């Protein structure tokens, strides 16, 4: 089997992407944030504290003839950005782009933190990291990909995120029309539960490539590109007036600037992030200070190839017995 679904930016900055997901019988369609950095499929629901729901579409398990309470199971997750959610668990039928999993754990939120409430466009998350990170207790549950894998034509999914435009998540096949050149594959460590890999270096604008190993995660659920402070300083030094602002929380730059590109290495191959992809707009409405899309990972504990990087590539998440990651230009 295969599936194919369009993923759409939630706003004009590409702060996140939402993908429609069918849950239950009859189908209830929720728009979920596909997150290769986590491993829980959780939704706003009829059980979510009423004051914490503000415009999201909810899953109502009592209206699904295929929903079953997973008795005794609870879940609770905290993301690196400080947001969180928790609740209980149902199993139900879940379909993405025509690919169906029966018996998928659907984690129903009883509580969500303020950032989730405040984002009316995201109805929940669909985790695509390794199932070892799943938070369900006392019986850990499998991700949608992990459940679908054996049925797929090939044990892979691909992320093709758009810049200020829709893109595609495919399951079970590689669309050879969706990229240019060849796909370069690189090794993955699953030891921390992430799609963790080592970039071979970087360049700023038209500058020379610096060969250096950068260990990080391919994370569709993180907006920005977080890299070591040395790399980030070298980038922003090429933008007149750019500076790190403790009060804003990262590098800012004059909105009048033209940003240079940023290149990262995948083996001997190179992925070029255009300068425009690094502009996250005014820090507050009407400001002439703009927020940068490349930020320091110091204090995070890991480097993060988030959407800013991934949207410049066609990315293969290869879930073969030994997982790997593939990157192509597009």
Swiss-Prot record:
Swiss-Prot/TrEMBL keywords: Aspartyl protease, Disulfide bond, Hydrolase, Protease, Signal, Zymogen
Does this entry carry the keyword Signal?
yes
Q: Does the keyword Transport apply?
A: no
EC nos:
3.4.23.22
Q: Which domain of life is it from?
A: Eukaryota
- GO MF term (any one): aspartic-type endopeptidase activity
Main enzyme class: hydrolase
The record's Gene Ontology biological-process terms are: proteolysis
Covalent S-S links between cysteines: 255-290
> What positions constitute the catalytic site?
35, 199
Q: Which segments constitute the Peptidase A1 domain?
A: 17-328
Reaction catalysis annotation: Hydrolysis of proteins with specificity similar to that of pepsin A, prefers hydrophobic residues at P1 and P1', but does not cleave 14-Ala-|-Leu-15 in the B chain of insulin or Z-Glu-Tyr. Clots milk
Family designation: Belongs to the peptidase A1 family.
The identity of this protein, by name, is Endothiapepsin
Species for this entry: Cryphonectria parasitica (Chestnut blight fungus)
Gene expressing this chain: EAPA
């Amino acid at each position: 089997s295969t599936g194919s679904a369009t993923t759409t930016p939630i706003d004009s900055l590409d702060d996140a992407y939402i993908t429609p997901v069918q849950i239950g019988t009859p189908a209830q369609t929720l728009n979920l944030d596909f997150d290769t950095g986590s491993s829980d499929l959780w939704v706003f629901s009829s059980e979510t504290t009423a004051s914490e729901v503000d415009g999201q579409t909810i899953y109502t398990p009592s209206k699904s003839t295929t929903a079953k309470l997973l008795s005794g199971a609870t879940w609770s997750i905290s993301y690196g950005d400080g947001s969180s959610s928790s609740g209980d668990v149902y199993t139900d039928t879940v379909s993405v782009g025509g690919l169906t999993v029966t018996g998928q754990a659907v984690e129903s939120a009883k509580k969500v933190s303020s950032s989730f409430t405040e984002d009316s466009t995201i109805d929940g998350l669909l985790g695509l990291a390794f199932s070892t990170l799943n938070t369900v207790s006392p019986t850990q549950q499998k991700t949608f990909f992990d459940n679908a894998k054996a049925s797929l034509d090939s044990p892979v999914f691909t992320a093709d995120l758009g810049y200020h435009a829709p893109g595609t998540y495919n399951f079970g096949f590689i669309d050879t029309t969706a990229y240019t050149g060849s796909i370069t594959y690189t090794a993955v460590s699953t030891k921390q539960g992430f799609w963790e890999w080592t970039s071979t270096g970087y360049a700023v604008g038209s500058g020379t490539f610096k060969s250096t190993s950068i260990d990080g995660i391919a994370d569709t659920g993180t907006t920005l590109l977080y890299l070591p402070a040395t790399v980030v300083s070298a980038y922003w030094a090429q933008v007149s007036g750019a500076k790190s602002s403790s009060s804003v929380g990262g590098y800012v730059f004059p909105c009048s600037a033209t940003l240079p590109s940023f290149t990262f290495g995948v083996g001997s191959a190179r992925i070029v992030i255009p300068g425009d992809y690094i502009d996250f707009g005014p820090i507050s409405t009407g400001s002439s200070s703009c927020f940068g899309g490349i930020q320091s990972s110091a204090g995070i504990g890991i480097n993060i190839f988030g959407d800013v990087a991934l949207k410049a590539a066609f990315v293969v998440f290869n879930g073969a017995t030994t997982p790997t990651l593939g990157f192509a230009s597009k």
